[PDB]
Design an enzyme around this catalytic site. Structure first.
Site, PDB file in Angstrom:
ATOM      1  N   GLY A   1    -104.722  -1.379 -47.220  1.00  0.00           N
ATOM      2  CA  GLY A   1    -105.863  -0.499 -47.371  1.00  0.00           C
ATOM      3  C   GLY A   1    -105.603   0.839 -48.012  1.00  0.00           C
ATOM      4  O   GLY A   1    -104.721   0.984 -48.866  1.00  0.00           O
TER       5      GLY A   1
ATOM      6  N   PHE B   1    -104.915   9.719 -49.159  1.00  0.00           N
ATOM      7  CA  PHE B   1    -104.840  10.054 -50.599  1.00  0.00           C
ATOM      8  C   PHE B   1    -104.051   9.008 -51.454  1.00  0.00           C
ATOM      9  O   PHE B   1    -103.698   9.288 -52.607  1.00  0.00           O
ATOM     10  CB  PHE B   1    -104.348  11.501 -50.896  1.00  0.00           C
TER      11      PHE B   1
ATOM     12  N   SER C   1    -102.664   4.365 -51.402  1.00  0.00           N
ATOM     13  CA  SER C   1    -102.821   3.005 -50.900  1.00  0.00           C
ATOM     14  C   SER C   1    -101.617   2.556 -50.073  1.00  0.00           C
ATOM     15  O   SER C   1    -100.489   2.960 -50.349  1.00  0.00           O
ATOM     16  CB  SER C   1    -103.077   2.030 -52.041  1.00  0.00           C
ATOM     17  N   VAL C   2    -101.884   1.720 -49.053  1.00  0.00           N
ATOM     18  CA  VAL C   2    -100.907   1.115 -48.140  1.00  0.00           C
ATOM     19  C   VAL C   2    -100.776  -0.397 -48.440  1.00  0.00           C
ATOM     20  O   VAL C   2    -101.786  -1.107 -48.560  1.00  0.00           O
ATOM     21  CB  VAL C   2    -101.253   1.356 -46.649  1.00  0.00           C
TER      22      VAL C   2
ATOM     23  N   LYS D   1     -96.579   3.344 -48.255  1.00  0.00           N
ATOM     24  CA  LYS D   1     -97.617   4.166 -48.866  1.00  0.00           C
ATOM     25  C   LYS D   1     -97.104   4.627 -50.204  1.00  0.00           C
ATOM     26  O   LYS D   1     -95.970   5.096 -50.321  1.00  0.00           O
ATOM     27  CB  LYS D   1     -98.001   5.371 -47.995  1.00  0.00           C
TER      28      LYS D   1
ATOM     29  N   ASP E   1    -106.866  14.755 -38.657  1.00  0.00           N
ATOM     30  CA  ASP E   1    -107.571  13.521 -38.943  1.00  0.00           C
ATOM     31  C   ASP E   1    -107.483  12.542 -37.748  1.00  0.00           C
ATOM     32  O   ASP E   1    -107.443  11.315 -37.930  1.00  0.00           O
ATOM     33  CB  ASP E   1    -107.165  12.888 -40.303  1.00  0.00           C
TER      34      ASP E   1
HETATM   35  C1  LIG Z   1     -97.927   4.064 -44.945  1.00  0.00           C
HETATM   36  C2  LIG Z   1     -99.324   4.775 -44.600  1.00  0.00           C
HETATM   37  C3  LIG Z   1     -99.185   5.608 -43.347  1.00  0.00           C
HETATM   38  C4  LIG Z   1     -98.916   6.967 -43.470  1.00  0.00           C
HETATM   39  C5  LIG Z   1     -98.779   7.779 -42.358  1.00  0.00           C
HETATM   40  O1  LIG Z   1     -98.520   9.103 -42.479  1.00  0.00           O
HETATM   41  C6  LIG Z   1     -98.915   7.192 -41.121  1.00  0.00           C
HETATM   42  F1  LIG Z   1     -98.776   8.008 -40.053  1.00  0.00           F
HETATM   43  C7  LIG Z   1     -99.179   5.851 -40.943  1.00  0.00           C
HETATM   44  C8  LIG Z   1     -99.319   5.037 -42.071  1.00  0.00           C
HETATM   45  C9  LIG Z   1     -99.606   3.583 -41.908  1.00  0.00           C
HETATM   46  C10 LIG Z   1    -100.848   3.106 -42.339  1.00  0.00           C
HETATM   47  C11 LIG Z   1    -101.291   1.833 -42.044  1.00  0.00           C
HETATM   48  N1  LIG Z   1    -102.588   1.373 -42.310  1.00  0.00           N
HETATM   49  C12 LIG Z   1    -103.765   2.148 -42.705  1.00  0.00           C
HETATM   50  C13 LIG Z   1    -104.434   1.517 -43.915  1.00  0.00           C
HETATM   51  C14 LIG Z   1    -104.802   2.216 -41.531  1.00  0.00           C
HETATM   52  O2  LIG Z   1    -104.788   3.514 -40.918  1.00  0.00           O
HETATM   53  C15 LIG Z   1    -100.433   0.957 -41.314  1.00  0.00           C
HETATM   54  N2  LIG Z   1    -100.901  -0.286 -41.040  1.00  0.00           N
HETATM   55  C16 LIG Z   1    -100.086  -1.058 -40.303  1.00  0.00           C
HETATM   56  N3  LIG Z   1    -100.548  -2.278 -39.972  1.00  0.00           N
HETATM   57  C17 LIG Z   1    -101.850  -2.727 -40.427  1.00  0.00           C
HETATM   58  C18 LIG Z   1    -102.091  -4.169 -40.088  1.00  0.00           C
HETATM   59  C19 LIG Z   1    -103.542  -4.493 -40.348  1.00  0.00           C
HETATM   60  C20 LIG Z   1    -103.857  -5.963 -40.351  1.00  0.00           C
HETATM   61  C21 LIG Z   1    -103.977  -6.568 -38.970  1.00  0.00           C
HETATM   62  N4  LIG Z   1    -104.733  -7.822 -38.941  1.00  0.00           N
HETATM   63  C22 LIG Z   1    -103.848  -8.958 -39.224  1.00  0.00           C
HETATM   64  C23 LIG Z   1    -105.385  -7.995 -37.644  1.00  0.00           C
HETATM   65  N5  LIG Z   1     -98.882  -0.728 -39.812  1.00  0.00           N
HETATM   66  C24 LIG Z   1     -98.464   0.489 -40.078  1.00  0.00           C
HETATM   67  C25 LIG Z   1     -99.170   1.428 -40.869  1.00  0.00           C
HETATM   68  C26 LIG Z   1     -98.772   2.740 -41.205  1.00  0.00           C
END
Ligand SMILES: CCc1cc(O)c(F)cc1-c1cc(N[C@@H](C)CO)c2nc(NCCCCCN(C)C)ncc2c1
EC number: 2.7.10.2
Length: 292
Positions: free
Chosen positions: A17, A21, A23-24, A43, A137
């Site tokens: 997602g 600022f 994409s992950v 990210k 946030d």
């Molecule tokens: C690298 C971005 C980032 C920056 C930061 O400063 C930070 F504190 C955290 C993160 C970050 C952001 C993510 N997702 C965002 C899009 C949503 O808030 C993460 N998503 C996952 N798992 C998601 C699995 C979903 C699917 C599940 N189905 C199968 C049910 N694990 C770790 C994640 C870590």
């Protein structure tokens, strides 16, 4: 050396997602090319501007400095693309966001479990505050689920460090702002503090007890209160006047009154009257003890 991630060994698996600022992506770090590598959350910046790269490096530095059970784990940085195309490597939390976890299971997650998550968010926020960091946030969308027993605070994309001489941080030219989670002084003066994260925490507690029921989200409720005819800047002007006049989110259906008391304490117009995260964690733990 192990915290040294080479881009060639990062195999893309799925897009996770959008962050504050960029994409992950879910990637497998596979330096042996046998698919036995660790699955990580990566990210990367979408638009690498001078201001955006600077903010991303600060986020990376902030995350690196945090070690707490209820804060998402920083793993490393991938520089292989040059210093202008940095990649942040985080642990992968397989249950996803608390928002999506709770929307999926609804009332199947009982009040005991929601207060266990509430307790964890408090402990995460309290540790964050010892480092003089303002998350800015706090929302269930930015809280991640490790397993049915543990949640962690994520998206540090808007996090600010307080000046050494001040108890608030003033944002001079705001970007995209989650105004429905904002304290009045954050909407009026663009001032952020531990107290404004407490205000946001009250909104997260509201979110939890609504079980993410579509029409009950904070934007839906506040928009209904100020009028669905309000658009753009006008939303902010009316939201400010509503909060000033004690307009607040309602008690969620079936919310224990003890829990609603905490929400309304967080939503105090007087900054100094808001509870600390230390006291919120003690109170939620005492509530959980009275329930068990
Ligand atoms: C690298 C971005 C980032 C920056 C930061 O400063 C930070 F504190 C955290 C993160 C970050 C952001 C993510 N997702 C965002 C899009 C949503 O808030 C993460 N998503 C996952 N798992 C998601 C699995 C979903 C699917 C599940 N189905 C199968 C049910 N694990 C770790 C994640 C870590």
């Amino acid at each position: 050396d192990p915290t040294q991630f080479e881009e060639r060994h990062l195999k893309f698996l799925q897009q996770l997602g959008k962050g504050n600022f960029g994409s992950v992506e879910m990637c497998r770090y596979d330096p042996l090319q046998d698919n036995t590598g660790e699955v990580v959350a990566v990210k990367k910046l979408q638009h690498s501007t001078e201001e955006h790269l600077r903010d991303f490096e600060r986020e990376i530095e902030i995350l690196k400095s945090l070690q707490h059970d209820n804060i998402v784990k920083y793993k490393g940085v991938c520089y292989s693309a040059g210093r202008r195309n940095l990649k942040l490597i985080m642990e992968y939390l397989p249950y996803g966001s608390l928002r999506d976890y709770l929307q999926k299971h609804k009332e199947r997650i009982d009040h005991i479990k929601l207060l266990q998550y509430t307790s964890q968010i408090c402990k995460g926020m309290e540790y964050l505050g010892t480092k003089r960091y303002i998350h800015r946030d706090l929302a269930t969308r930015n809280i991640l689920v490790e397993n049915e027993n543990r949640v962690k605070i994520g998206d540090f994309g808007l996090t600010k460090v307080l000046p050494q001489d001040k108890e608030y941080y003033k944002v001079k030219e705001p970007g995209e702002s989650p105004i429905f989670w904002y304290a009045p002084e954050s909407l009026t003066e663009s001032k952020f503090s531990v107290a404004s994260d407490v205000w946001s925490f009250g909104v997260v507690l509201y979110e939890l007890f609504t079980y993410i029921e579509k029409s009950k989200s904070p934007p839906a409720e506040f928009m209904r209160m100020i009028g669905n005819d309000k658009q753009g800047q006008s939303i902010v002007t009316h939201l400010i006047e509503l909060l000033k006049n004690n307009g607040r989110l309602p008690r969620p259906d079936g919310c224990p009154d003890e829990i609603y008391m905490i929400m309304t304490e967080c939503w105090n117009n007087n900054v100094n009257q808001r509870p600390s995260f230390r006291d919120l964690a003690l109170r939620v733990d005492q509530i959980r003890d009275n329930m068990a």
